[PDB]
Design an enzyme around this catalytic site. Sequence first.
Site, PDB file in Angstrom:
ATOM      1  CG  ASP A  58     107.118  71.126  24.100  1.00  0.00           C
ATOM      2  OD1 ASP A  58     106.364  70.786  25.052  1.00  0.00           O
ATOM      3  OD2 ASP A  58     106.957  70.623  22.969  1.00  0.00           O
ATOM      4  CB  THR A  59     107.213  71.387  30.296  1.00  0.00           C
ATOM      5  OG1 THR A  59     105.820  71.525  30.028  1.00  0.00           O
ATOM      6  CG2 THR A  59     107.777  72.765  30.688  1.00  0.00           C
ATOM      7  N   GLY A  60     106.569  69.390  27.613  1.00  0.00           N
ATOM      8  CA  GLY A  60     106.044  68.072  27.216  1.00  0.00           C
ATOM      9  C   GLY A  60     106.971  67.344  26.244  1.00  0.00           C
TER      10      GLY A  60
END
Lengths: 99, 99
Positions: B25-27
């Site tokens: 999850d890059t967010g």
Amino acid sequence: PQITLWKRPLVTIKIGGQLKEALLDTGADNTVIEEMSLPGRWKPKMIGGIGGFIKVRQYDQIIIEIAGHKAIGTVLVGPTPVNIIGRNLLTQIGATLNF
Amino acid sequence: PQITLWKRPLVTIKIGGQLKEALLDTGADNTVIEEMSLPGRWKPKMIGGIGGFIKVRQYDQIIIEIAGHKAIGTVLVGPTPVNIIGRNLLTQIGATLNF
Ligand SMILES: COc1ccc(S(=O)(=O)N(CC(C)C)C[C@@H](O)[C@H](Cc2ccccc2)NC(=O)O[C@H]2CO[C@H]3O[C@@H]4OCC[C@@H]4[C@H]32)cc1
Ligand SMILES: [Cl-]
Ligand SMILES: [Cl-]
Ligand code: NA
């Protein structure tokens, strides 16, 4: 480009004729933008997250420019704390995770 | 590997000797895992997302394998809807976003 992840992967987007900052978010199925007006029809939706659900407006066939790359797809609009570019538009710009 | 985003970027992780599924999850700034027992002391943290904030338990210097890559770092434990690998450990496995 290749974006490392030492910092939040924020990029400039253009949507509805407006420039905004948004997070490239592989953990998001959908694109969710803070309250703004968009043209055409919409329908209500609920979307979940870490801390529960928010109600959003679902607009279909919206064009967004993401860090220079045009894409079209559904955009959810509502009280998200952050503008998020989710997988539905990340695929269109050919984004991938690499390690 | 090179992971496209037409599906959720789910991988297998190993923590405390158990296998689990988690989202890359890059967010997410932070790795957040569903309720489980971890060794050592923990510290309080409040994290927030869509919906609002939740309290989690912060465990530092936890050994965790992600898609076969070893990481050792902070893991938050709490009522997250899905196990999330955030940037703090994505950087340890060498992950980048590319387009
Ligand atoms: C159906 O389509 C959707 C459904 C859900 C979401 S989401 O925003 O709830 N989320 C889904 C995920 C929980 C499975 C996407 C995430 O990338 C959010 C995206 C997000 C970012 C900021 C604020 C709200 C959401 N990140 C997040 O919750 O991070 C948490 C954990 O670490 C901290 O870093 C972040 O930055 C500090 C706060 C958050 C904390 C988006 C589109
Ligand atoms: Cl779409
Ligand atoms: Cl592709
Ligand atoms: Na439309």
